[PDB]
Amino acid sequence: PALTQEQKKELSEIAQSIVANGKGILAADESVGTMGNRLQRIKVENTEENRRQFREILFSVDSSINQSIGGVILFHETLYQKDSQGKLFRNILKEKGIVVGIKLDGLDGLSERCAQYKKDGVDFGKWRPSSLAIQENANALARYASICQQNGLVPIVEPEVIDHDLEHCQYVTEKVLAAVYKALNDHHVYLEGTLLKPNMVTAYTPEQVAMATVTALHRTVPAAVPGICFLSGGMSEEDATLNLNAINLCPLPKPWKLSFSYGRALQASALAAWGGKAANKEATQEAFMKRAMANCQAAKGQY
Amino acid sequence: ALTQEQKKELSEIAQSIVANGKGILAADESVGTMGNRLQRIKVENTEENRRQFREILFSVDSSINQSIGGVILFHETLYQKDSQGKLFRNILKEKGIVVGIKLDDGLSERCAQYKKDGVDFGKWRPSSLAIQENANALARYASICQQNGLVPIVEPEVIPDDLEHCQYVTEKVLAAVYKALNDHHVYLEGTLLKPNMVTKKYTPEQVAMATVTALHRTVPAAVPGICFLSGGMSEEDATLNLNAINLCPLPKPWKLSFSYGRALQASALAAWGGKAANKEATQEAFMKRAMANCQAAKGQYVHT
């Protein structure tokens, strides 16, 4: 059921708007379990309620945020939560211009689950599924990505990350990404209405990390991909910025928006500034709003 | 196992070819072909007639090195000498231009040799299965050149059989190849691509869009340059389209040049008509098409 020019228009508008000016993506979709340690770390208990609380706070921050955040991904749960005044978390973000994202993380029930998701205000989906192996999750992605685009969703293709050297990690990422896109072509996936969520070729200063990241990236990632928001993963809010800055500085061809799709580097500080106490929204919305702008500048190199 | 040392080279050469709106001349016509050419100007096919015409081209003013950054050559020709016993090979080396040989098991041996002779880049052109073998051959040879310090001009394929049709095909055939080159770990930065142009009536606008689209869907931003082949197009159209493609409002991380033959020698060969009296005229039309296309490569070209 190949896309019609119209479906592309829609897809394109979205993927492009999730990075429109350097606006990265927020990883506010952690699992019931993950959120648990996150909140746990701050010397607090993991409970459904206390979630809607740290999430209502973030999505409530000044509207200026839509200058650093182009879209936010949510766990199933949050996509339905109502803020204090019974306001849908969904709409608190939509109104302010941010785009609704949904963790779709088996391709069974996806062409159905997505169809619904779109109706429920979601415009893009996240999902992460040896030569044999490498080709597997690839054809997989390819299908899942082809599915989202059928239900007006914008696939954020995530190529799984797998003690060696940078040069090593670089060769693997390259070898992988090549299979990812090759497969994706095989499945006639509108690259324009897509988005890549790769890892930073890391173990080595940010420049060296960005020089080995972009390189491997430009040798593999097609110009037609509107943007590539990185995943912080184990990088301090201060290193997920340094690196993403150098990346947007590395002296090489870079036809795609070199954005971010952070969670630990966008919440951490704003996560401590809460600690259960729901009156210090300032400290919270302070530590969150401080990183969204900063890492919005990493996506510009003006950092 | 390319060393950061040869990559250095492979690239310098890869880029020096497509520097500033500069393209490649394909004077590599194989005997039989070259005769078909001369035959159109009613000129007998002789080892000499060939040697002369091509002598005229390569003998054109050195300012020809502002439009032509590299010339390909056919076996025979790599060893012929101009009227004064001088070598086209070196006539071109000294004249700025880089010399390129046409290569088409024993390959890697030949290369090192053609490298010793002054050639710094070569060429070799070839169903789901089909395209795969093509892709992979084009990749073995690719790494064989870089092994022997040459810059592999990857040439894909396609059949004359609308626009969106030739496009969709081009993108497949092009993914097979850059994927191929990856499985074989080909230093993409020491490469060059000679794609066809994705081409119901069509304006350079479209013919260029359909094309650049497909190109930025498949060909990596690491490839330093895409030198389109004009096969079939008039010298004029090869230019309108190379210009068009160069102005297309799309992303283009790579130089979009020309690696023309018919499009560059066409007129320059008809004005000579095999009469050594017109060496003058000939060199004009060449120089003319030579600069003309460079402009198209800068998108800076105007038809009147």
Q: How far apart are the first and last CA of chain B?
A: 51
- Mutation target among B212, B218, B226 for the A interface, most CBs of A within 10 A: B218
Which among B240, B188, B238 is positioned nearest to B218, based on CA atoms? B188
Give the domain extent around B90: 1-304
Resolution in Å equals: 3.0
**B46 token code pair:** 């002789």
Q: DSSP secondary structure string, B92-133?
A: HHHTS-EEEEE----HHHHHHHHHHTTEEEEEE---HHHHHH
Q: Let me know: does A72 contact A30? Beta carbons within 8 Å.
A: no
**DSSP-assigned letter for residue B241:** H
Residue A170, min C-alpha distance to chain B (Å): 12
Of the candidates B299, B253, B298, B283, the residue with the CA atom closest to the CA atom of residue B21: B298
B3 vs A290: CA distance, rounded Å: 44
Q: b/e map of A81-119 (b: 16 or more CB within 10 Å)?
A: bebeeeebbbebbeebbbbbbbbbbeeeebbeebeebbe
Catalytic annotation, residues of A: 158, 197
Q: Do A253 and B179 touch (CB under 8 A)?
A: no
Cα distances from A116 to residues A104, B60, B176, B223, in angstroms, run 12, 68, 36, 42
Residue B40: count other Cβ atoms within 10 Å of its Cβ.
11
Of B302, B98, B90, B83, residue with least CA distance to B204: B302
The CATH number assigned to the domain holding A250 equals 3.20.20.70
* Domains of chain A: total: 1
Host H or E run for residue A111: helix A110-119
Determination approach: X-ray
How many Å apart are CA A229 and CA B223, to the nearest integer?
Answer: 23
- Closest residue to B216, CB basis, from A175, A215, A222: A222
A–B interface: beta-carbon pairs under 8 A:
61
B251/A255 CB distance under 8 A: yes
- Of B206, B275, B276, B217, which Cα lies nearest the Cα of B247? B206
Task: State whether B216 and A174 contact (CB < 8 Å).
Answer: no
